[PDB]
Enzyme design. Structure first.
Site, PDB file in Angstrom:
ATOM      1  N   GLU A   3       0.347   5.295  15.530  1.00 55.38           N
ATOM      2  CA  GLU A   3       0.029   3.893  15.271  1.00 55.38           C
ATOM      3  C   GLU A   3       1.050   3.259  14.328  1.00 55.38           C
ATOM      4  O   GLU A   3       0.711   2.692  13.289  1.00 55.38           O
ATOM      5  CB  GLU A   3      -1.389   3.752  14.717  1.00 55.38           C
ATOM      6  CG  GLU A   3      -2.481   4.077  15.722  1.00 55.38           C
ATOM      7  CD  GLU A   3      -3.016   2.841  16.419  1.00 55.38           C
ATOM      8  OE1 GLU A   3      -2.205   1.962  16.780  1.00 55.38           O
ATOM      9  OE2 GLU A   3      -4.248   2.747  16.605  1.00 55.38           O
ATOM     10  N   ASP A   4       2.323   3.368  14.704  1.00 56.07           N
ATOM     11  CA  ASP A   4       3.420   2.718  13.992  1.00 56.07           C
ATOM     12  C   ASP A   4       3.615   3.280  12.587  1.00 56.07           C
ATOM     13  O   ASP A   4       4.010   2.554  11.673  1.00 56.07           O
ATOM     14  CB  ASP A   4       3.212   1.202  13.925  1.00 56.07           C
ATOM     15  CG  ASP A   4       3.129   0.565  15.298  1.00 56.07           C
ATOM     16  OD1 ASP A   4       4.107   0.679  16.067  1.00 56.07           O
ATOM     17  OD2 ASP A   4       2.087  -0.048  15.609  1.00 56.07           O
ATOM     18  N   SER A   5       3.334   4.564  12.396  1.00 57.83           N
ATOM     19  CA  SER A   5       3.643   5.258  11.159  1.00 57.83           C
ATOM     20  C   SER A   5       4.922   6.070  11.349  1.00 57.83           C
ATOM     21  O   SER A   5       5.502   6.114  12.437  1.00 57.83           O
ATOM     22  CB  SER A   5       2.468   6.140  10.735  1.00 57.83           C
ATOM     23  OG  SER A   5       2.777   6.885   9.571  1.00 57.83           O
TER      24      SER A   5
END
Ligand SMILES: [Mg+2]
Ligand SMILES: [Zn+2]
Ligand SMILES: [Zn+2]
Ligand SMILES: [Zn+2]
EC number: 2.7.7.6
Lengths: 147, 86, 266, 69, 56, 45, 56, 115
Positions: A3-5
């Site tokens: 999740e966009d980490s």
């Protein structure tokens, strides 16, 4: 890294990846309220100053300013200023004839810390003395920083 | 007291609701945390909520729920007689 | 002696290349991990700045100083500051260096690592000296100064491991490969038309025979015959890097055994 | 601002090769890749470390010192 | 709308969030500083007297 | 009195509370406080 | 917080760093990701609210 | 700032033991060993050597959270064989193998000329 980490190399961070300097500036002036009241840069004492902050005033000099290169932490006062008070005003008691000044100092931000880099003293357009104090800090990547 | 429906003609559901269970557990946990007498044997417990859950499981909570109706009447239902199936 | 085998292909002062045969994959991986993150080394840990009129910041210079590699051949004779009985530091657990640079010339003057001067009692040890690894004889370009600028500071160097901070890492890149011909089918090669033509052949392929081109997949084979190449930053000799990695792993396992015996007594 | 002391990715010492790299580019008229290879930088992690560095300390040194001595 | 239906409240915390594949479905990781700032008033009972004394 | 440095001609001055904030040599109205002479510790991490 | 599933009760887990940590499977109800999003945490102050929060 | 001190990764804290051994009630003759201030470097090696023992039925290790530097090792042996003794045997095998490797590396290195 879902999740966009992202996952960053701690060794690279230690070696200097995406490290930054943060400079913060504080400004303070000596205001003259009429011909009677005037503020002055001072190192207020516990016996003559009222409502002074709970922080530590040990780092201030005789001019109420911290010399550059000194380390400061949360609640530390960087610009010490005092102003006179009118009589016939008692607040929470603790107001005796000894007290004749009140603190108006500028404290460092609670969550910030660092080393004082450059402090300059000059006069504004009106001739009142005012000072600017700069504080350095190092920002290293963390588990919350955005890239 | 015309607003108190006699037990012989209660028409509400005989099953405890989720909100009723939550409030009963919370109230009993609060009472226990305020040093209230516990009517269930404890095999070793320190959480008031866990103690209240044990009391509810064994039907040993001396509380009665006063279910209100839109007209102002109410019905009294004992926790012991209320079925806990949810 | 009839255990793991070693065959050195290329030996140098900065890189050592070898084949580690008759060893387990777990053992080889643990060896490289220990060589990367658990070999004690000497590096600058604290810095006190007396004068700094440079265009650079004190923390900037401190970080650059801490990343300088220092000699650690006799590091085992030094003690940990945490395990030493002293107020702040002493000659038994630390090394003190001093840096003094002035812009005496009109042109820019470069402050290197060779200007660091040891002011502690080494007691005949072989630690502290910054590593010089260039033709000109200088070291790391620590900083630059113009006329009228001065840098005066004292560094205190303590021993540590790269797990605490990467600056203590004595080992650079470690080549690590096995089964260059993919005979164990541990990888599914991504391809568009032909995987063999699209994937270059590793240089280690010359040390193993190619597949028989029609033989059944060998399901009894296990990973072995690892090709490793250790690169060292210069703090300690590369052969010493390998030897001390093995020593550290052995000490850790022995510590586990000793703790088990201690619990057995109680 | 100044050349990093260590390569970020692997930790190889690269702060002692900035002057040599510049000398190879200027006096020897060598290409950047050839100079990097001659300096002993084989991994592209170090190649980028020395290739993409910007020397801002030279510009910072153009200002007069704040304090004399 | 600005002070009765909604209002600023105490005993709250705010910070950036992250994904932890090693946390249970209902578990939430709380920073140690936020934990040290936020407090819960626990009533002293015979079942927790010793623990509360140790915390004090 | 405390020691300051002119922001233009970089001259060290010794100023008191009564003296006006001004460089007695060139006349500049901006002064930088001299760096403290007490050692400051920095970690090399 | 456009729907009731955007505000749910979690069990605290005190961890090292400066960010909240949550399971990946609970991001969809919150409509949240880890590009910099922030989330609020509220601490109940009574046993009744504690039990209600953990049971509803 | 809430970043833990880096020395917590390897230095043992006060009142903390390197090993914490507890019986496992899930299966007979099974034990769970918690290694403190240790990581995959020891976990993988010890587990791999344990799997080579013929009298070991189960050997696995896991790191619950990378934030904390500790790992759990589950060992189940055949009836009559102590998991403690199995771990001792694995550790002794590791020590002997590493010593042999060190001797071989030293003798091979002494034969080189460039360094
Ligand atoms: Mg977002
Ligand atoms: Zn000592
Ligand atoms: Zn590199
Ligand atoms: Zn001047």
């Amino acid at each position: 890294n879902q999740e966009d980490s992202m996952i960053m190399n701690q060794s690279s961070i230690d070696r200097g990846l995406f490290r930054s300097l943060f400079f913060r500036s504080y400004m303070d002036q000596e205001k003259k309220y009429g011909m009677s009241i005037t503020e002055t840069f001072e190192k207020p004492q516990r016996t003559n100053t009222l409502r002074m902050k709970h922080g530590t005033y040990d780092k201030l000099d005789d001019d109420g300013l911290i010399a550059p290169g000194v380390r400061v932490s949360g609640e530390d006062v960087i610009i010490g200023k005092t102003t006179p008070i009118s009589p016939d005003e008692e607040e929470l008691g603790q107001r005796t004839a000894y007290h004749s000044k009140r603190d108006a100092s500028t404290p460092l931000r609670s969550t910030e810390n660092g080393i004082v880099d450059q402090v300059l003293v000059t006069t504004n357009q009106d001739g009142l003395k005012f000072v600017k104090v700069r504080v350095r800090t190092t920002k290293i990547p963390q588990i919350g920083d955005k890239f | 007291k015309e607003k108190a429906i006699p037990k012989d003609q209660r028409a509400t559901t005989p099953y405890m609701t989720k909100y009723e269970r939550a409030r009963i557990l919370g109230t009993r946990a609060l009472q226990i945390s305020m040093n209230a007498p516990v009517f269930v044997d404890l095999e070793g417990e320190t959480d008031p909520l866990r103690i209240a859950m044990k009391e509810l499981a064994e039907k040993k909570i001396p509380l009665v729920i006063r279910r209100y109706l839109p007209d102002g009447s109410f019905e009294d239902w004992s926790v012991e007689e209320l079925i806990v199936d949810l | 002696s009839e255990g793991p085998q070693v065959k050195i292909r290329e030996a140098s002062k900065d890189n050592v290349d070898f084949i580690l045969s008759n060893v387990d994959l777990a053992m080889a991986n643990s060896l490289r991990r220990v060589m990367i993150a658990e070999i004690p080394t000497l590096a600058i840990d604290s810095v006190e700045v007396e004068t700094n009129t440079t265009v650079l910041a004190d923390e900037f210079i401190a970080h650059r100083l801490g990343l300088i590699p220092l000699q650690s051949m006799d590091i085992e004779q030094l003690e940990y500051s945490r395990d030493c009985f002293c107020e702040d530091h002493c000659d038994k657990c630390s090394v003190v260096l001093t840096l003094q640079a002035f812009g005496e010339s009109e042109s820019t003057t470069n402050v290197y690592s060779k200007d660091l001067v040891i002011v502690s009692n080494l007691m005949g040890r072989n630690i502290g000296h910054p590593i010089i690894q260039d033709k000109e004889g200088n070291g790391v370009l620590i900083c630059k100064l113009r006329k009228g600028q001065e840098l005066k500071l004292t560094c205190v160097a303590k021993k540590g491991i790269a797990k605490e901070h990467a600056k203590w890492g004595p080992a650079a890149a470690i080549e690590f490969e096995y089964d260059p011909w993919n005979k164990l089918k541990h990888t599914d090669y991504w391809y568009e038309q032909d995987s063999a033509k699209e994937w270059p052949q590793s240089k280690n392929c010359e040390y193993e025979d190619p597949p028989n081109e029609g033989d059944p997949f060998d399901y009894k084979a296990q990973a072995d015959t690892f090709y490793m190449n250790v690169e060292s930053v210069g703090s300690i000799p590369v052969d010493q890097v390998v030897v001390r990695g093995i020593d550290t792993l052995q000490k850790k396992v022995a510590s586990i055994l000793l703790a088990l015996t201690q619990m057995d007594q109680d | 601002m100044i050349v990093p002391v260590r390569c970020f990715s692997c930790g190889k010492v690269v702060g002692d090769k900035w002057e040599s790299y510049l000398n190879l580019l200027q006096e020897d008229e060598l290409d950047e890749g050839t100079a990097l290879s001659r300096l002993g930088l084989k991994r592209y992690c170090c190649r980028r470390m020395i290739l993409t560095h910007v020397d801002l300390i030279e510009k910072f040194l153009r200002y007069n010192p704040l304090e004399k001595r | 709308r600005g002070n009765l239906m909604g209002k600023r409240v105490d005993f709250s915390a705010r910070t950036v969030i992250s994904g932890d594949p090693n946390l249970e479905l209902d578990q939430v990781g709380v920073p140690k500083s936020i934990a040290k700032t936020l407090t819960y008033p626990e009533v002293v009972t015979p079942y927790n007297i010793d623990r509360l004394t140790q915390l004090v | 009195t405390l020691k300051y440095i002119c922001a233009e001609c970089s001259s060290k001055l010794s100023l008191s509370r009564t003296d006006a904030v001004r460089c007695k040599d060139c006349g500049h109205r901006i002064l930088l406080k001299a760096r403290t002479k007490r050692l400051v510790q920095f970690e090399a991490r | 917080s456009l729907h009731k599933m955007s505000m749910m009760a979690h069990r605290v887990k005190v961890i090292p760093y400066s960010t909240f940590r949550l399971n990946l499977s609970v991001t969809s109800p919150y409509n949240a990701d880890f590009d910099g999003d922030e989330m609020n945490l509220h601490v109940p102050q009574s046993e009744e609210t504690r039990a209600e929060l953990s049971q509803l | 700032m809430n970043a833990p001190d880096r020395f917590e990764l390897f230095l043992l804290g006060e009142g903390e033991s390197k090993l914490k051994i507890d019986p496992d009630t899930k299966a007979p003759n099974a034990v769970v060993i918690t290694f403190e201030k240790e990581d995959h470097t020891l976990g993988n090696l010890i587990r791999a050597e344990l799997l080579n023992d013929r009298k070991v039925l189960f050997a696995a290790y896991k790191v619950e959270h990378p934030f904390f530097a500790r790992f759990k090792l589950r060992i189940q042996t055949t009836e009559g064989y102590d998991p403690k003794d199995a771990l001792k045997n694995a550790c002794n095998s590791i020590i002997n193998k590493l010593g042999a490797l060190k001797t071989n590396f030293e003798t091979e290195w002494n034969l080189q000329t460039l360094a």
